Every structure is written in C-alpha cells, then in structure tokens.
Amino acid sequence: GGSPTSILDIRQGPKEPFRDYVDRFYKTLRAEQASQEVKNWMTETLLVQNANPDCKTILKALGPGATLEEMMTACQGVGGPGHKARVLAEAMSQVTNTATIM
Amino acid sequence: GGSPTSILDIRQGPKEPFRDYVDRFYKTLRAEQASQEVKNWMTETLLVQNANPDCKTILKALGPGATLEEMMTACQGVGGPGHKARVLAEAMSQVTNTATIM
Amino acid sequence: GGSPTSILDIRQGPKEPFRDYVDRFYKTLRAEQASQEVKNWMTETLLVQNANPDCKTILKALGPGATLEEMMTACQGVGGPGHKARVLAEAMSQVTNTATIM
Amino acid sequence: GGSPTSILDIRQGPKEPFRDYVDRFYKTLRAEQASQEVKNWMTETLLVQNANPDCKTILKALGPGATLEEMMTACQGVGGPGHKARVLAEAMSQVTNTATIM
Amino acid sequence: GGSPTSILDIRQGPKEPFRDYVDRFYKTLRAEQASQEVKNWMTETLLVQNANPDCKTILKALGPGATLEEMMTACQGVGGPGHKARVLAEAMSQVTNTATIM
Amino acid sequence: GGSPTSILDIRQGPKEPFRDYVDRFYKTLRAEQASQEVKNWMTETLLVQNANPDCKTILKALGPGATLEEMMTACQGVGGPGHKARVLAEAMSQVTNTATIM
Ligand SMILES: O=P(O)(O)O[C@H]1[C@H](OP(=O)(O)O)[C@@H](OP(=O)(O)O)[C@H](OP(=O)(O)O)[C@@H](OP(=O)(O)O)[C@H]1OP(=O)(O)O
Ligand SMILES: CC(C)(C)c1ccc([C@@H](Cn2cccc(C(F)(F)F)c2=O)NC2Cc3ccccc3C2)cc1
C-alpha cells in the first residue's frame, strides 16, 4: 500500500498534459496490484482527483463515469495556455456575466 | 497497444511550439506503420485534438487539417507567449467586446 | 539537532505540487528523529506553515483534522495553472463579488 | 526529407527572445546547404513565423526583414517579462483603449 | 571585487522562494570573510535587494530589522503561484479597490 | 572584430536578472579588448539596449548613466514575477489610469 507509484501518489503537473500524466498513472497501475474494476476507481476518480486542477476541475464537471474519450478530449484543454485560455474566458466571464454572484 | 507511439496520443506541449511537435507527430509516424490515407487522421485531426488547444482553435480557425504550411503558419501563434501575443487580447475582447455573453 | 531537511527548513516550491514537497517533508521527516506523536504535529502544522501559500491557504481552508487523502484532494487545487484555474475566477471575485472591501 | 536544422523546424521558444532564436535560425542554416537569397524566406519570413509570436507581433509592426540591428533592438522586446514590460499593456489596449472592437 | 558569491552577485530566482535563496546568500556568506555586523548588510539590505522582488517588496513592508524568521514567514508568500495568490490578487485591487489611482 | 561576445551582441535573458547578465557583459567585456572609456559606452548604452527590456524600460526611467548600484537596485525589479509585481500593476494602469490614451 502506497508502494512507489501505486496511483495513490501519481501526479499531473500544471505543465504536465493529461494524456501525459495518464501514462504515469496507467503504467503504474500495472505496477500496482489492482483488479480491473478497482483500477477503474483509479482512472475514473483518482485520475480526476490527484491530477492537475485543469483536469480535476474538468473530469469532475463532465462528471465521473463519462468515457475516457469524453474526458480525453475535454482534458486535452489541460496544458497551461490551452486551458488557461478557456479558463480565462469562463472565469473572466463568470465573475462578470455568467456567474456574477450577488 | 503500448508499443511506442501508434499516433493515438502523440503530443504537442502546451508551450512547446507546434513545429517541434510536428516533427514529433511525424516522428512516431515514421515508426508507425500508418498507410498514407490512414495517416490522414494522424496529420489532420491528431494534429488538432492532442496537439495543444492553441492549434485546436487555430486549425479550427483555418479549417481542421489545413495544409502543413497553413495549420503551421497559423500555428506559430501556439506556445505560451506565442498565443499570449494574440489570444490574450482576443479572449480579453471575447469576454468584453466581441463575445460578451449576456 | 534541527539538522538540514529534517523539517526545520522544509520549504515548498510555490508551484511545486502539494504532495511533491510533502513527499520531501515526509521522506525527510525520516531524517528527523521524531516521536510518532512528535512527528504528526509537524505534518499538519509545519507542513502548512512553510509550504505553498496555495496549499497553506487551502489546508487552512479545509480546516485542520483533514486526512492527507483529504488535504491532497483540496490542495491538488495548488499549482500554476492548477491554482490559477481556481483562483482566477475567485480572486477576480474577491475584489468584485465575495470579498469586496468597502 | 525529415532532416532537422533546415529551418523547416527551427524555432524560438515562446519565452525565448528574438535574438536567442536568431542564432538558432542563422547557425542552423550553417548546417543547411543554401544560397544567401535562398536563406531569405527564412531570415525574413520563418524568422517571422516560428520565431515566438512575441516577435511576430513586433515584426508585424516593425516590419519583416528589418536589419539584424533593427529586428534586434526591436524584437529585443520579445521575452517573458521582457515583452511584458510593454505587450501586456498593449493587449490591454487592443481590447479596451486603442484597438477596441465594437 | 567580482569574487564569486560575495552577496554582491548573490541572487534569488524571480520564482525562487525566499529561504532557498537565503541558503545561497548565507552559504556563501560563511565564505565571505566578514564580521557579524558586515554579514548584517548582506542580511539586512542585500538580502532584500536581490531576493526576488516578490519578497523585496515584502521585507520592506515588514521593514528591515525583522528576524530572518519574520521575513521568512511573511516571505513564504514569495513564489510564483505562491506570491501571486496573495500579491497578484493584491494587484487586481491595485487597479480597482485599494490602489485605484486618481 | 565582432568576435563573439564583444558586447555588440551581449544579451540578457528575458527572465535573466539584470545583475546576472551584467556579469555576462562585464566578464565578456574582459574578453573584449576595449578602452575603459569605450567600455563605458558599452556599459551605459549597450547595457541598456540589449539587456532584457525589463531593464530597458527601467534604466531608461532612472536615467541612462545611472550608477550600476542605481540600475541594479531598480533592475532588481527585472524578472518574471519580480518585474510583474510592479509592471503588471503598471501596464494595467497604463491603459486605464495613468497612460490612458484618448
Ligand atoms: O510564473 P508566472 O509569473 O506565473 O508566469 C509564467 C512565466 O512567465 P513570465 O515570463 O511572465 O514570468 C513563465 O516564464 P518562464 O520563466 O518559464 O520563461 C511562462 O513561460 P513561457 O513563456 O515559456 O510560456 C509561464 O508559462 P508556462 O507555465 O506555460 O511555461 C507563465 O505562466 P502562466 O502562463 O501560467 O501565466
Ligand atoms: C491566459 C494566458 C495564456 C495563460 C496568459 C495571458 C496573459 C499573459 C500575460 C501578458 N502577455 C502578453 C503577451 C505576451 C507575453 C509574453 F509572456 F509572451 F511575453 C505576456 O506576458 N499577462 C498575465 C500573466 C499572468 C499570470 C497570472 C496572473 C496575471 C497575469 C497577467 C500571459 C499568459
């Protein structure tokens, strides 16, 4: 438990792409002793929870249980400028137009 | 599956210029036994989806899979600073002037 | 006594992942000959005091008593684009909507 | 074909100054068997295209083919905080003050 | 004159946390054959002068004469996402709420 | 004549601090066989021109010929977050408050 790279500490860097950090997770899932159904918790949820807020904030929005292609595409936005561009508009437009809280 | 790069997920860094990546997109291609037509996903849409959203927007800006000179010329706008030069102002007006969502 | 890396100076890179530096502070607490109890108060507090104002502002936000799997989950928000993706919208509203100081 | 250092892949890092890439486009052509005029789409245009858009926005105003003393003194504006000294404010004036689009 | 690491050229990375850099300044101070008082110019004013403007502003804010622990604690804010979360946000209100110039 | 690093091309990285590069300009000046008076024009002007526009906007502000201590102290503001802490507030106010162009 918690052996090197059991998924439990796998991590996506802010500058690490989703499709990249994923290689760091899946590969190490093999390095981890988990049933396929169990790994599904690691890929479905952990992949969202411990990996780069660009994607955590996304896969959570898409929701858990969405296919990995729906997430793979939606998470390709991850990557600073690429994400930050959309996040810039959404956030900038949140505080002011769409999410103006009063 | 898991063989070194089949052009499933080759990747453009979020800051890595499109061109560095085109050589890499192509690099896996020289190793991937992808027929030329098949390579069309590899050139056009791979070069769109996993290629850093800046090209995803730009390739959309020209048209997806535009000539390697067209997607590229336009894609030198990719990269952080590369896009920040333009995309910042445009997005900045996406929120306020051009795309103000009401 | 209070030798280098023990915990006395364990400092976190600002963008460095919560968990990463925590890995420092953990793998390094070994270097710090501490009682099992004398270790923990360093892990909940000393981790918070000298680490990532993003993870310190969060660890504090969750409120102490949050198991690592709970800290890590929240401080996974920490990060350049990682914390900027969540803070961009927030800070932008700290000034305008939520923390508007009059 | 697939040969690097022909300009077809030379590149200025998005953070990288105009000048830092100048050598990348000059020296990389030392390795390329070319004519001086032939090297000119490069010195003039690729030097404008993949050379980190901080310079493409500068060279677009300054103009292309500017002498190495001009593109230098001018695209020395290229640069992470180096351009930010000016460019941030410029984009900030591209949307709101000078180049605002209605 | 120009002797390596006399504190004259010691410096803090623009993102480097205050302390990591302080380890440099101090480590080489041990080497600069100085008196306790002399080392105190390096700790009071050079420390401030080169320590990455994220903190250079802070140390002044607390005011010099504060314990290195004092500046350190107030300088754990130093850092990219680490200093921006607290200070960039402050800049956001420098335009709108607190430093709105007139 | 025009030997490498003769000051004609010495350059400061966009992120490279003024002090660092100044060490690249001074040391390389040793490599440059120049009279002191001549070196002075290189230290006064050339240092200003090809040294990271962060400083260029600063040195120009302090006034050319400011003593290295003056250029340094102010150019310790040079840097990514370090210059940004100031410059972001400034450019932002160049568009809206102080330099609003009508
Ligand atoms: O660290 P921050 O103050 O948040 O800003 C950084 C910094 O930009 P600055 O030049 O303004 O300091 C990086 O510069 P480097 O020191 O890494 O060169 C830049 O890098 P690039 O020019 O290469 O894009 C990076 O972007 P990234 O994290 O994509 O590498 C950008 O961060 P933000 O885009 O998140 O604001
Ligand atoms: C949205 C994103 C892509 C991430 C982006 C947007 C804008 C910038 C630069 C301006 N800007 C504009 C053009 C070129 C440069 C360059 F760096 F290339 F020289 C530059 O600094 N301002 C913001 C940077 C930042 C980070 C967090 C808090 C505030 C700011 C202001 C940088 C990055």
XYZ file of C-alpha atoms and ligand atoms in Angstrom:
681
model
C 0.000 0.000 0.000
C 1.491 3.323 -1.071
C 4.393 1.465 -2.658
C 6.153 3.710 -5.186
C 3.643 4.852 -7.778
C 0.677 2.775 -6.623
C -1.524 5.628 -8.167
C -2.044 6.865 -4.746
C 0.775 9.319 -5.191
C 0.584 9.654 -9.000
C 0.510 13.369 -10.001
C -0.125 15.545 -13.015
C 1.994 18.636 -13.101
C 0.419 22.014 -14.005
C 2.717 21.894 -17.025
C 2.137 18.076 -17.495
C -0.552 17.243 -20.224
C -3.450 14.942 -19.271
C -2.607 12.383 -21.934
C 0.928 12.551 -20.479
C 0.386 12.228 -16.774
C -2.012 9.492 -17.669
C 0.867 7.433 -18.948
C 2.380 7.945 -15.487
C -0.848 6.610 -13.927
C -1.826 3.655 -16.166
C 1.681 2.333 -16.382
C 1.994 2.423 -12.730
C -1.458 0.890 -12.264
C 0.229 -2.275 -13.739
C 2.958 -1.646 -11.181
C 0.045 -1.553 -8.645
C -1.845 -4.680 -7.648
C -5.448 -3.778 -8.534
C -8.311 -5.626 -10.165
C -9.561 -4.070 -13.364
C -12.779 -2.886 -11.721
C -10.685 -1.400 -8.927
C -8.305 0.366 -11.403
C -11.437 1.811 -12.847
C -11.818 3.737 -9.488
C -8.184 4.990 -10.027
C -8.821 6.008 -13.641
C -12.347 7.350 -13.167
C -11.980 9.111 -9.925
C -8.292 9.368 -8.925
C -7.401 10.408 -12.441
C -9.652 13.347 -11.684
C -8.751 13.865 -8.001
C -4.920 13.826 -7.886
C -4.208 15.133 -11.357
C -3.661 18.830 -12.283
C -6.718 21.160 -11.463
C -7.009 21.833 -15.183
C -8.416 18.320 -15.456
C -9.687 17.709 -11.956
C -11.920 20.769 -12.320
C -12.977 19.268 -15.776
C -13.456 15.495 -15.380
C -15.448 16.464 -12.274
C -17.604 18.883 -14.414
C -18.055 16.308 -17.248
C -18.724 14.115 -14.256
C -17.384 10.698 -13.075
C -18.430 7.832 -15.356
C -18.045 9.750 -18.598
C -15.997 7.812 -21.060
C -12.271 8.225 -21.135
C -12.622 9.675 -24.689
C -15.058 12.308 -23.473
C -12.505 13.090 -20.744
C -9.508 12.609 -23.108
C -10.800 15.241 -25.402
C -12.189 17.522 -22.717
C -8.946 17.225 -20.812
C -6.815 17.957 -23.841
C -7.711 21.540 -22.892
C -5.258 20.857 -19.974
C -1.953 22.453 -20.654
C -1.465 25.920 -19.452
C -2.252 28.433 -22.242
C -4.578 25.915 -23.900
C -6.575 25.504 -20.701
C -5.949 28.902 -19.249
C -7.335 30.377 -22.496
C -10.735 28.762 -21.941
C -10.466 29.150 -18.176
C -9.602 32.801 -18.743
C -12.823 33.388 -20.691
C -15.039 31.257 -18.432
C -13.649 32.695 -15.218
C -13.439 36.266 -16.517
C -16.930 35.902 -17.846
C -18.015 34.181 -14.596
C -17.292 36.911 -12.137
C -18.729 39.476 -14.562
C -21.501 37.996 -16.810
C -22.474 34.317 -16.263
C -21.570 33.757 -12.604
C -21.953 37.244 -11.228
C -22.813 36.459 -7.650
C -24.786 38.936 -5.550
C -1.094 -1.359 -27.718
C 1.557 0.270 -25.529
C 4.005 -0.169 -28.420
C 5.982 3.026 -28.757
C 3.690 5.604 -30.250
C 0.967 4.391 -32.738
C -0.308 8.083 -33.247
C -3.026 7.579 -30.766
C -1.800 10.012 -28.398
C 1.281 11.718 -29.826
C 1.521 15.232 -28.107
C 2.246 18.884 -28.510
C 3.410 20.593 -25.416
C 1.141 23.429 -24.141
C 4.087 25.747 -24.588
C 6.084 23.508 -26.943
C 5.822 25.127 -30.407
C 3.647 23.402 -32.936
C 6.618 22.802 -35.182
C 8.686 20.981 -32.538
C 5.659 18.857 -32.192
C 5.009 18.460 -35.903
C 8.389 16.792 -36.208
C 7.297 14.567 -33.242
C 3.910 13.977 -34.619
C 5.716 12.831 -37.717
C 8.428 11.118 -35.646
C 6.074 8.497 -34.345
C 4.669 8.293 -37.864
C 7.977 7.147 -39.413
C 7.832 4.314 -36.826
C 4.084 3.753 -37.036
C 3.081 1.617 -39.985
C 0.297 4.033 -40.957
C -0.773 3.971 -44.644
C -0.945 7.474 -46.148
C -4.779 7.736 -46.057
C -4.872 6.318 -42.602
C -2.210 8.907 -41.808
C -4.814 11.456 -42.644
C -6.222 11.147 -39.047
C -2.620 11.274 -37.977
C -1.958 14.560 -39.875
C -5.227 16.379 -39.663
C -7.131 15.597 -36.537
C -4.357 14.186 -34.366
C -2.551 17.356 -35.288
C -5.830 19.154 -33.956
C -7.030 17.141 -30.821
C -3.883 16.214 -28.840
C -1.855 18.960 -30.389
C -2.171 21.613 -27.704
C -5.567 23.607 -27.820
C -3.816 26.574 -29.451
C -3.609 24.568 -32.625
C -7.062 23.236 -31.852
C -8.522 26.636 -32.021
C -6.252 27.795 -34.992
C -6.623 24.679 -37.027
C -10.357 25.391 -36.496
C -9.584 28.984 -37.396
C -8.242 27.989 -40.830
C -10.072 24.703 -41.145
C -9.110 21.316 -39.462
C -6.214 19.591 -41.244
C -5.296 22.624 -43.363
C -2.041 22.201 -45.292
C 1.041 21.617 -43.210
C 2.013 25.148 -44.213
C -1.429 26.573 -43.346
C -2.020 24.892 -39.945
C 1.646 25.584 -39.102
C 1.940 29.190 -40.259
C -1.103 29.925 -38.255
C 0.110 27.637 -35.509
C 3.286 29.507 -34.864
C 0.812 31.668 -32.854
C 0.923 28.499 -30.432
C 3.150 28.185 -27.382
C 2.534 30.191 -24.330
C 3.973 33.607 -25.407
C 3.170 32.651 -28.816
C -0.579 32.657 -28.181
C -0.399 35.194 -25.331
C 0.766 37.648 -28.002
C -2.560 37.317 -29.821
C -5.045 35.032 -27.994
C -4.750 37.142 -24.856
C -6.216 40.230 -26.442
C -8.777 38.345 -28.497
C -10.009 36.368 -25.427
C -9.816 39.543 -23.470
C -12.262 41.009 -26.006
C -14.162 37.644 -26.102
C -15.233 38.471 -22.578
C -15.766 42.209 -23.079
C -16.144 43.315 -26.745
C -16.553 40.564 -29.390
C -18.149 37.658 -27.497
C -19.648 39.305 -24.438
C -22.088 36.666 -23.299
C -25.394 38.003 -21.983
C 19.637 18.891 16.239
C 17.390 20.652 13.727
C 19.754 19.434 11.020
C 19.096 20.410 7.354
C 15.998 18.928 5.679
C 14.697 17.467 8.929
C 11.622 19.801 8.816
C 13.081 22.911 10.243
C 13.655 24.261 6.790
C 11.311 22.021 4.810
C 10.131 24.526 2.192
C 7.797 24.000 -0.707
C 8.263 25.234 -4.169
C 5.299 27.658 -4.858
C 4.115 25.897 -7.969
C 5.613 22.593 -6.793
C 2.759 20.129 -6.065
C 1.475 19.937 -2.538
C 2.061 16.231 -2.430
C 5.547 16.548 -4.044
C 7.035 18.819 -1.409
C 5.021 16.878 1.097
C 6.931 13.890 -0.206
C 10.024 15.923 0.686
C 8.762 16.744 4.167
C 7.732 13.052 4.616
C 10.705 11.204 3.171
C 12.772 13.810 5.006
C 10.882 13.569 8.378
C 12.765 10.185 8.489
C 15.910 12.228 8.657
C 14.232 13.982 11.554
C 14.407 11.673 14.538
C 10.908 12.379 15.922
C 8.457 10.577 18.177
C 5.463 9.167 16.338
C 3.364 11.861 18.078
C 6.152 14.494 17.845
C 6.097 13.866 14.096
C 2.431 14.404 13.324
C 2.016 17.992 14.759
C 4.864 18.878 12.234
C 2.885 17.178 9.392
C -0.393 19.027 9.969
C 1.110 22.355 11.053
C 4.760 22.628 9.900
C 3.649 21.292 6.531
C 1.100 24.177 6.462
C 3.340 26.926 7.851
C 6.293 26.813 5.483
C 4.523 25.410 2.356
C 2.849 26.646 -0.808
C 0.670 29.697 0.177
C -1.810 27.970 -2.259
C -1.735 24.736 -0.213
C -1.415 26.655 3.007
C -4.381 28.815 2.114
C -6.185 25.555 1.271
C -5.033 23.304 4.101
C -6.256 26.134 6.296
C -9.443 26.373 4.201
C -10.324 22.720 4.726
C -9.549 23.316 8.365
C -7.032 21.014 10.249
C -8.006 17.410 11.001
C -8.232 16.603 7.260
C -6.542 13.314 6.489
C -3.903 13.563 3.816
C -6.244 11.944 1.261
C -8.484 14.859 2.150
C -5.719 17.563 2.167
C -4.175 16.280 -1.035
C -7.581 16.333 -2.686
C -8.137 20.045 -1.860
C -4.503 21.151 -2.253
C -4.483 19.322 -5.535
C -6.039 22.770 -6.485
C -2.445 24.144 -5.780
C -0.317 24.771 -8.934
C 0.453 27.475 -11.505
C -2.471 26.818 -13.897
C -3.554 24.358 -11.203
C -4.299 27.086 -8.597
C -4.689 29.848 -11.184
C -7.588 27.958 -12.794
C -9.471 28.093 -9.494
C -8.051 31.389 -8.289
C -8.568 33.277 -11.463
C -12.293 33.182 -11.024
C -12.035 33.551 -7.245
C -9.565 36.457 -6.903
C -11.408 38.175 -9.647
C -14.429 37.942 -7.369
C -12.589 38.572 -4.140
C -12.225 42.082 -5.406
C -15.631 42.374 -7.060
C -18.208 39.964 -5.579
C -17.236 37.944 -2.456
C -14.551 39.990 -0.679
C -15.448 43.420 -1.977
C -13.978 45.607 0.709
C -15.753 48.907 1.323
C 13.119 14.944 -46.030
C 12.768 14.521 -42.260
C 16.186 16.222 -41.962
C 16.294 18.665 -38.948
C 18.100 22.031 -38.904
C 16.794 23.068 -42.359
C 14.545 25.984 -40.839
C 11.622 23.828 -41.559
C 11.920 23.023 -37.915
C 13.975 25.887 -36.439
C 12.141 27.525 -33.515
C 12.185 30.379 -30.937
C 10.862 29.389 -27.684
C 7.710 31.241 -26.713
C 9.633 32.549 -23.640
C 12.781 32.762 -25.784
C 13.892 36.343 -27.067
C 14.039 37.309 -30.627
C 17.827 37.222 -30.554
C 18.100 33.908 -28.789
C 16.401 32.385 -31.774
C 18.303 34.484 -34.351
C 21.312 32.289 -33.838
C 19.021 29.269 -33.929
C 17.927 30.364 -37.475
C 21.443 31.509 -38.524
C 23.637 28.678 -37.264
C 21.050 26.058 -38.233
C 21.399 27.313 -41.783
C 25.205 26.876 -41.492
C 24.356 23.172 -41.456
C 21.929 23.759 -44.350
C 23.384 23.871 -47.863
C 21.874 27.160 -49.079
C 22.190 30.295 -51.086
C 22.156 33.637 -49.282
C 18.958 34.753 -51.076
C 17.504 31.316 -50.571
C 18.028 31.688 -46.857
C 15.987 34.917 -47.168
C 12.364 33.326 -46.789
C 13.898 32.284 -43.547
C 15.803 35.372 -42.404
C 12.725 37.345 -43.411
C 9.663 35.024 -43.176
C 10.314 31.868 -40.963
C 12.278 34.184 -38.690
C 8.903 35.936 -38.622
C 6.784 32.761 -38.421
C 8.079 30.228 -35.909
C 10.133 32.714 -34.087
C 7.995 33.042 -30.929
C 4.965 35.355 -31.767
C 6.248 37.908 -29.255
C 8.381 38.781 -32.226
C 5.674 38.115 -34.839
C 3.542 40.794 -33.324
C 6.648 43.065 -33.144
C 7.907 42.227 -36.571
C 4.369 42.723 -37.889
C 4.583 46.380 -36.869
C 8.315 46.921 -37.154
C 8.008 45.012 -40.315
C 9.884 41.910 -41.553
C 13.392 41.766 -42.985
C 14.320 44.531 -40.557
C 18.070 44.612 -40.319
C 19.589 42.492 -37.694
C 20.231 45.706 -35.811
C 16.532 46.693 -36.156
C 14.783 43.351 -35.543
C 17.230 43.039 -32.673
C 16.730 46.346 -30.924
C 13.046 45.919 -31.608
C 12.401 42.325 -31.038
C 14.614 42.509 -28.003
C 11.070 43.483 -26.768
C 10.445 39.716 -27.241
C 10.705 37.935 -23.880
C 8.788 36.673 -20.832
C 8.776 39.824 -18.634
C 10.902 41.462 -21.365
C 7.859 41.840 -23.596
C 5.513 42.041 -20.682
C 7.188 45.302 -19.907
C 5.258 46.551 -22.992
C 2.943 43.822 -24.588
C 0.709 43.134 -21.602
C -0.377 46.729 -21.626
C -0.664 46.695 -25.429
C -3.156 43.799 -25.464
C -4.809 45.531 -22.600
C -5.150 48.454 -25.051
C -6.016 46.119 -28.040
C -9.340 45.338 -26.492
C -10.306 48.393 -24.471
C -8.449 51.576 -25.427
C -6.779 51.680 -28.892
C -7.831 48.624 -30.917
C -11.204 48.081 -29.294
C -13.646 46.256 -31.499
C -17.310 47.280 -31.461
C 35.910 42.604 -6.436
C 33.894 40.158 -8.537
C 34.974 37.442 -6.100
C 32.408 34.628 -6.568
C 29.363 34.846 -4.322
C 30.341 37.765 -2.100
C 26.498 38.571 -1.820
C 27.071 41.249 -4.377
C 26.068 38.888 -7.113
C 24.163 36.502 -4.860
C 20.520 36.394 -6.042
C 17.087 34.843 -5.641
C 15.346 33.348 -8.565
C 12.252 35.553 -9.560
C 10.254 32.480 -8.578
C 12.809 31.014 -6.110
C 11.364 31.017 -2.592
C 12.937 33.441 -0.201
C 14.584 30.867 2.034
C 16.043 28.615 -0.822
C 17.851 31.672 -1.958
C 18.748 32.676 1.609
C 20.509 29.321 1.900
C 22.686 30.605 -1.012
C 23.380 34.068 0.439
C 24.170 32.593 3.845
C 26.149 29.584 2.497
C 28.453 31.878 0.589
C 28.413 34.442 3.463
C 30.064 31.767 5.531
C 32.716 32.036 2.805
C 32.898 35.852 2.566
C 35.412 36.577 5.394
C 33.225 39.136 7.188
C 32.325 40.330 10.660
C 28.918 39.658 12.148
C 27.974 43.283 11.520
C 29.217 43.096 7.941
C 27.242 39.957 7.249
C 24.261 42.076 8.579
C 24.386 44.460 5.462
C 24.129 41.282 3.393
C 21.293 40.051 5.571
C 19.542 43.390 6.014
C 19.834 45.234 2.734
C 21.477 42.901 0.025
C 19.227 40.110 1.215
C 16.335 42.448 0.493
C 17.858 43.957 -2.697
C 18.429 40.708 -4.594
C 15.919 38.435 -3.087
C 13.468 38.300 -5.997
C 11.092 41.380 -5.988
C 8.266 39.187 -4.696
C 9.970 39.484 -1.361
C 11.994 42.662 -1.915
C 8.741 44.473 -1.605
C 7.674 42.360 1.475
C 10.819 42.769 3.532
C 10.475 46.407 3.139
C 6.762 46.099 4.052
C 7.501 44.415 7.384
C 10.506 46.641 7.472
C 14.236 45.586 7.795
C 15.439 44.694 11.319
C 12.829 41.873 11.395
C 14.028 38.436 12.215
C 15.055 36.298 9.327
C 12.237 34.097 10.672
C 9.947 37.141 10.494
C 10.791 37.974 6.889
C 10.770 34.227 6.146
C 7.231 33.722 7.415
C 5.980 36.789 5.557
C 8.105 35.616 2.622
C 6.746 32.088 2.436
C 4.263 34.067 0.305
C 7.249 34.576 -2.095
C 6.997 32.322 -5.155
C 5.160 32.225 -8.459
C 1.694 30.888 -7.774
C 2.984 31.204 -4.129
C 3.417 35.090 -4.323
C 0.749 35.681 -6.929
C -2.036 34.094 -4.956
C -1.521 36.723 -2.229
C 0.107 39.574 -4.169
C -1.217 39.228 -7.666
C -4.629 39.255 -6.172
C -3.482 42.399 -4.385
C -2.554 43.892 -7.800
C -6.022 43.108 -9.022
C -7.370 45.501 -6.420
C -4.431 47.861 -7.073
C -6.399 48.756 -10.186
C -9.925 48.547 -8.780
C -10.153 48.656 -4.937
C -7.055 49.722 -2.926
C -4.523 51.358 -5.258
C -7.046 52.782 -7.654
C -5.164 55.809 -8.856
C -6.903 59.145 -9.416
C 36.340 42.500 -34.826
C 32.877 41.359 -33.941
C 34.388 38.493 -32.136
C 31.761 36.614 -30.198
C 30.666 38.261 -27.013
C 32.317 41.554 -27.877
C 29.274 43.460 -26.329
C 27.936 44.121 -29.708
C 25.875 41.022 -29.174
C 25.936 40.551 -25.384
C 22.316 39.807 -24.249
C 20.199 39.492 -21.093
C 17.683 36.692 -20.949
C 14.056 37.946 -20.620
C 13.951 36.254 -17.321
C 17.732 36.527 -16.731
C 18.168 39.184 -13.995
C 19.955 42.398 -14.727
C 22.651 41.517 -12.305
C 23.239 38.141 -13.891
C 23.576 39.491 -17.445
C 25.532 42.448 -16.241
C 28.011 39.770 -15.130
C 27.863 38.423 -18.732
C 28.502 41.927 -20.089
C 31.278 42.786 -17.704
C 33.093 39.420 -17.965
C 32.761 39.383 -21.634
C 33.984 42.942 -21.732
C 37.185 41.462 -20.244
C 37.204 39.274 -23.351
C 36.634 42.466 -25.358
C 39.842 44.487 -25.858
C 38.289 47.872 -25.176
C 39.483 51.017 -23.638
C 37.785 51.901 -20.424
C 36.062 54.964 -21.911
C 34.840 52.787 -24.701
C 33.645 50.182 -22.194
C 31.774 52.944 -20.570
C 29.635 53.478 -23.708
C 29.062 49.710 -23.723
C 28.078 49.736 -20.020
C 25.894 52.842 -20.420
C 24.283 52.349 -23.721
C 24.775 48.817 -24.869
C 23.922 47.525 -21.423
C 20.704 49.421 -21.731
C 19.887 48.324 -25.298
C 20.297 44.535 -25.406
C 19.667 43.728 -21.829
C 16.155 42.443 -21.284
C 13.552 45.170 -21.983
C 12.628 44.867 -18.299
C 15.697 46.788 -17.587
C 15.401 48.862 -20.731
C 12.206 50.358 -19.536
C 13.899 50.773 -16.074
C 17.336 52.144 -16.914
C 15.594 54.452 -19.334
C 13.367 55.537 -16.423
C 16.177 56.002 -13.862
C 18.061 57.872 -16.471
C 20.957 56.477 -18.581
C 24.263 56.627 -16.893
C 22.677 55.860 -13.547
C 25.274 54.141 -11.415
C 25.334 50.427 -11.550
C 24.114 50.470 -7.970
C 21.107 52.575 -9.077
C 20.411 50.494 -12.241
C 20.863 47.384 -10.151
C 18.653 48.288 -7.304
C 15.891 49.266 -9.635
C 16.609 46.419 -12.036
C 16.491 44.002 -9.270
C 12.767 44.635 -10.204
C 13.754 42.774 -13.538
C 12.475 39.128 -13.561
C 9.290 37.118 -14.229
C 7.057 37.606 -11.109
C 9.643 40.100 -9.809
C 9.059 42.588 -12.647
C 5.455 41.553 -12.888
C 4.702 42.502 -9.360
C 5.357 46.041 -10.390
C 4.881 46.019 -14.169
C 1.603 44.187 -14.124
C 0.217 46.955 -11.895
C 1.853 49.490 -14.157
C 0.784 48.326 -17.638
C -2.623 47.764 -16.235
C -2.652 51.389 -15.135
C -1.018 52.473 -18.422
C -4.213 51.544 -20.152
C -6.746 52.627 -17.551
C -5.361 55.168 -15.039
C -2.080 56.960 -15.878
C -1.393 56.426 -19.584
C -4.976 56.116 -20.779
C -4.765 57.092 -24.421
C -7.725 59.015 -25.832
O 5.382 32.112 -13.320
P 4.364 33.181 -13.589
O 4.703 34.611 -13.041
O 3.017 32.757 -13.149
O 4.225 33.273 -15.205
C 4.857 32.254 -16.039
C 6.238 32.777 -16.594
O 6.000 33.973 -17.448
P 6.781 35.317 -17.194
O 7.816 35.443 -18.217
O 5.792 36.416 -17.306
O 7.460 35.328 -15.808
C 6.895 31.689 -17.453
O 8.123 32.121 -17.872
P 9.417 31.242 -17.758
O 10.282 31.844 -16.677
O 9.025 29.784 -17.566
O 10.054 31.506 -19.120
C 5.999 31.375 -18.600
O 6.677 30.546 -19.526
P 6.616 30.642 -21.140
O 6.985 31.963 -21.742
O 7.611 29.617 -21.667
O 5.225 30.209 -21.540
C 4.809 30.616 -17.890
O 4.078 29.784 -18.799
P 4.122 28.190 -18.721
O 3.808 27.763 -17.312
O 3.086 27.823 -19.795
O 5.502 27.730 -19.033
C 3.946 31.784 -17.154
O 2.729 31.172 -16.586
P 1.276 31.469 -16.973
O 1.030 31.287 -18.453
O 0.570 30.321 -16.251
O 0.857 32.836 -16.563
C -4.018 33.249 -20.440
C -2.500 33.022 -20.581
C -2.036 32.397 -21.881
C -2.047 31.956 -19.558
C -1.736 34.286 -20.427
C -2.394 35.551 -20.541
C -1.731 36.788 -20.390
C -0.356 36.781 -20.100
C 0.432 37.998 -19.683
C 0.681 39.060 -20.792
N 1.487 38.724 -22.041
C 1.011 39.028 -23.260
C 1.709 38.726 -24.371
C 2.932 38.104 -24.259
C 3.525 37.870 -23.042
C 4.785 37.109 -23.049
F 4.959 36.458 -21.912
F 4.847 36.186 -24.064
F 5.837 37.894 -23.128
C 2.786 38.308 -21.854
O 3.272 38.398 -20.654
N -0.142 38.757 -18.520
C -0.673 37.800 -17.441
C 0.290 36.802 -16.964
C -0.344 36.440 -15.593
C -0.384 35.322 -14.750
C -1.272 35.296 -13.623
C -1.900 36.474 -13.203
C -1.929 37.557 -14.064
C -1.192 37.510 -15.253
C -1.099 38.622 -16.275
C 0.294 35.507 -20.027
C -0.355 34.357 -20.156
